[PDB]
Structure formats: structure tokens, C-alpha cells
Design a protein around this ligand. Sequence first.
Ligand SMILES: O=c1ccn([C@H]2C[C@H](O)[C@@H](COP(=O)(O)O)O2)c(=O)[nH]1
Ligand SMILES: O=c1ccn([C@H]2C[C@H](O)[C@@H](COP(=O)(O)O)O2)c(=O)[nH]1
Lengths: 316, 316
Amino acid sequence: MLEQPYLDLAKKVLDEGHFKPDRTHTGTYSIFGHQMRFDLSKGFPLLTTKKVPFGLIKSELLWFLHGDTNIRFLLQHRNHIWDEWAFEKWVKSDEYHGPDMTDFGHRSQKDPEFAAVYHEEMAKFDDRVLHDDAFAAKYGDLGLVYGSQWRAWHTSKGDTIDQLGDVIEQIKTHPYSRRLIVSAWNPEDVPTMALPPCHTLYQFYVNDGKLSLQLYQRSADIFLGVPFGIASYALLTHLVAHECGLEVGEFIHTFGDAHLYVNHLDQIKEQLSRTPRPAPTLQLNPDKHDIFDFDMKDIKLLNYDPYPAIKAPVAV
Amino acid sequence: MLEQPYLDLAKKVLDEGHFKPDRTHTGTYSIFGHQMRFDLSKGFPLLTTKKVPFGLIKSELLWFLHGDTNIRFLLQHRNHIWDEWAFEKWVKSDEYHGPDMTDFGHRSQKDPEFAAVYHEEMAKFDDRVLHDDAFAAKYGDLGLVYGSQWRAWHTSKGDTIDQLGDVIEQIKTHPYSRRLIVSAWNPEDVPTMALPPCHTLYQFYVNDGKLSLQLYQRSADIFLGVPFGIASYALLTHLVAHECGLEVGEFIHTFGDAHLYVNHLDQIKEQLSRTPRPAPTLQLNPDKHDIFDFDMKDIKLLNYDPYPAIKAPVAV
Ligand SMILES: O=c1ccn([C@H]2C[C@H](O)[C@@H](COP(=O)(O)O)O2)c(=O)[nH]1
Ligand SMILES: O=c1ccn([C@H]2C[C@H](O)[C@@H](COP(=O)(O)O)O2)c(=O)[nH]1
């Protein structure tokens, strides 16, 4: 079944997984060096053993494709994944004249009252980002995020490079190249970044009229992270392919530190007791071609019949 | 046997290998996405099924470790791997007042007279690089090569970053980090580089007091390239480990485009008819610790009993 590699990877971290400490002082079962492949011709690798929000995955990838880094786009799309990061910048700022917020996330877990307070301050921050144009420009712009790494790499000459744009043209004029690489890792920025790119780098490959993509993920949260990651990059492999008039090949997910937080063990076992149903089908608008111009309505997901969602706490 | 993964990878490219064109207009049998691991506690993965020059591998890695990019060091060490690149720069220069040299490499294959001519001009170039200090500074400095990528990454602020130095300190003060990454890929330089880094990026990992390393090689020549690559990075895993007082773990080689040139098929088959002997043993000088200060004499290779070398033409 299409999503087997994932379950396999999951089962493995449990079995061969060696305990290992980490930043968000929780424990993890980790493995180092893994690689799994998904033959995109057999279907879309969005998990059926647990409900994954394709809407979220879809709007995030577009945000990246637009070379956008401001949270406003996502919010307009009911997407709040990157919310914490902008909120945090806001709170550490001179203007934040509100309640105690330092460590809002980790605190909310065992909230002394926090729950509503945090959740409301956040509602406020967002609401302003959506309307106060100047506020959005200030606290709503994350800066160095995938959108800017992929499409506006800052060069030593104060210029900007559209890695993705260039690779796409390359694919068209030189499909057999081995230099079709887009990179999110900048040695200059990581020493002072909030969260250095987990999706460190990806390579494209063309053969027999099919497009393939390999991702190198330096670090991954098997439970919460991987499900989206596989969905996100498989989508990209289709999008880029659609634009180049190529057939879709394989999506390959390679790992550095693949781990499962100690507070996710029961949940994952639950999942491992499920039987994958047939994988869904992706449908891209035939009329449109420049993916940089793709809109949500141009991406349909057909036949996604999943098992109920699984709730598990974010380890912090 | 330790080197099995390599033979396995080799056998595979023959069997599942899909023909694919390439730059040096020759043909290739290619696969996309492969990963193999070598448990460095079982021995050193320097091939016994064919003689690999450990001396060359050793002096090259030191050259990188010194953050050096001038060919003089290598020549002083009888190492000529990077010779062509500096020679080419020399020939395309105003000063090169010699015979016809444009395409020296590919031509030498079916030399109309070239052999000696090229080989002598080269001897001249080198000889000068070794003695004429100003010549070395001019035509002997390659510039952007591993030594500068690893230890003097040029930032947008005209400064320089010692990625390797920083990662080593990191390993010591934060061994459980998932950000121990050194990168040779610069989106800014690749568009105008002679040869963008095949050894694209590598990640370190520490667990149970052992050090592991994973390399991401965007493109590889299974026959001529991989044998050195495995040797080079396994050596680094030992060196860094020796410096951090860690035990050696696994070396993991991940691949983008792994290929075998069509003009290497017979030779590789020859190799595949050999039986691996026990792997050699690496011995590092116990007295020395700062690997940036390691000298050739500080690296011993014990019990290397290989099969005679295999000669095969460099495809161009
Ligand atoms: O697809 C993804 C992207 C990010 N993360 C995770 C990786 C780490 O678990 C955490 C960040 O902590 P560090 O890896 O930076 O140390 O976020 C994932 O799990 N999956
Ligand atoms: O360990 C190594 C380093 C380099 N090369 C190869 C990779 C390619 O075969 C060739 C460069 O051509 P491009 O990959 O840049 O297209 O040099 C190897 O085989 N092995």
C-alpha cells in the first residue's frame, strides 16, 4: 500500500529507536539515516491511517511558491501553522503592552489561566495582521522562511536569486542535469535563526519523461511532521511536473535525525493498528500551467477516505 | 563484509540502471536515490576488491581541513587530482603562450600528438606553481573548493565562516544537536562554477557516545568516484571523532544521481567477480588531537590487502 514506508519507518523508530535527549526537553526515540520512496504514479501519499489536513498543506505550499513570507496570506486562508513565530516576535517587541506571555507555548500545556489569555492575545495579533497593513509589514513578516529561501536567496551582492524559478527552467532546457537542486540552508543565517530549515534541501531528477524529487530532512518528528512533509513535497513534484509537461515519478524522503517524541508512543501504536485504504488521487487544473500562478481552486484531491484524526500534544 | 553495500550498489546500477545521457557526452546507467551504510567499528571501508590510493585520499582531506584551496599543497604531496582545473584556468589566460590546448583532456584520449605535449605543459604549470610563489597565488588558487566552502564561507557581509570549526565545537558542547551540518552548496556560486560540489552536504550525529556522519552526494560516478568518497568521509568521521573523544559510529552515503559510465561496464564486472578480504584498520596518532593540525604521518592504515588495481578511462 502506498503509505507503507511511513508505517515501516514508524514501527522501526519504536524497535531500533535509541533514546536521545533534545531541545524541547522531552525524550525522543531516534534513528539516523533513513530513506523511503513513494511511486507517485500509484496515487497521492496523503495518509489514510489518520486524517491529514490537505487544505493546510495546500495553502502553505502556495505561500512558499509565491516567494511570500508574510503570515497574512496564510491567515486569509484560515491557515495558522506559522502563527507562533510571528506572535513571538510581536511579544518580544516594545509595542507588546499585554499580559505575561514569555513561554506562552510551553506554559499553555499546564495553563494556570493561560489558555484563553494566550488564545485571545493571539486572536488579536492575527486580526491586526489581517487588517492593519503596517502591522502586517512589521510583525507579520517572518523574513527568512522557505518562500524567501527558495525564491529570493540573498546574495553577498545585495541581489536576490529565484532558485526554484531557475531550477524549473533548467528542467525544461536540461532535464538530464544533476544540478537541479534548491537549497534552504544558509551557513550565514542558521547561527541566528529561530528554526533552521528541517527540509534542508531537495533534488530533482528527470528520466524516461518522468519527474522525481528527493528531499533531505535533517530532522523530523515522525508523528506530527512527516505526514505533512510527504504530502507537501509530493504535491510539489506534481506541480513542477505539470508545469514541465512531464509525468510524475517517485518522491524520495531521506532523513537525518528521524525521531518520535516519548509523548507520542501510544498514539502512534493506535495508528499502527489500522489498515491503509487505497490512496487518494490528485487533480490539477488542466488549463493552468505556471504553478507560480496556481490558486487553491486549481488543486483537487479525489477519493480521500481516512481513519479519524489522532490528537497528540506538541512537545515543548 | 564491510564493502558489500558498494558492490550491491554497483550490481544494482547494472540491473535496474536506466540509460541516461549526460554532460561529458558518453552514456550512463543511472539510478536516483540510494543510501548505504558502513559500520565504522568493523573496520575502514577502503575497498579491497580493487586498490585505492589511500595516500591521495589522505592528503586531499588534509588540504580541505586546512581550509586551503591552492594546488601547491597537493603537489608538494605528489597529489595531482585537482591539476586539470588550475591548468585550464592557466590556459584560458593571457599569459599562456604555448601550443593548442583547448580541450586538452578529451583530446588526449585520441591524441593526435597531444599525449606528451599536454603532459609536458602540465609538468611546466605544476613546476612553476611549486616554485614561482606569485604564479601559485595566481593560477594555483582554485578559489571556491571544499576547503573554502567548509572553512571560509563568504557571507553577504564580506566576512568568512568556519562551518567545520563551528560544527566541531558544537559537537563538543551540544552532541545531541540536529543542526550539525556543513554545506558545500551556495546558490550564489553554482550558476558560474566549473564543478558544483558533488559532495553537496553532510550531517553529523552523536548517540551512545559514538559519532556518525551522513553525506548527501547529488551526483556520483560509481566506479571512479564512490571508492574515494567512502574513504574520504569515513576518514573525516574518524578524525572529528578522535578530536571530540567520541567512538566512531556509522558512515552513511546517500545519493542523488548514482551512475556508471557506459565505458566502465566491463571493468566493474571484473570487480564484481572478486571476493572482499577483511577490511583494513585506521590508526590515528594518540598524542595529537586538533585535527586541523594533523599531518600525513599521523594517519596509519593497517592491514590493507587489496586485489590489483583496475584501469578504466575517464569519460569526457
Ligand atoms: O516536516 C517536518 C518539519 C519540521 N519538523 C520538526 C523537526 C524537529 O523535530 C523540530 C525542530 O527542532 P530541531 O530539529 O531544530 O532541533 O521540528 C518535523 O517534524 N517535520
Ligand atoms: O565522489 C565523487 C565526486 C565527483 N564525482 C563526479 C560526479 C559526476 O559523475 C561528475 C560531475 O558531473 P556533474 O555531476 O556535475 O553533472 O563528477 C564522483 O563520481 N564521485
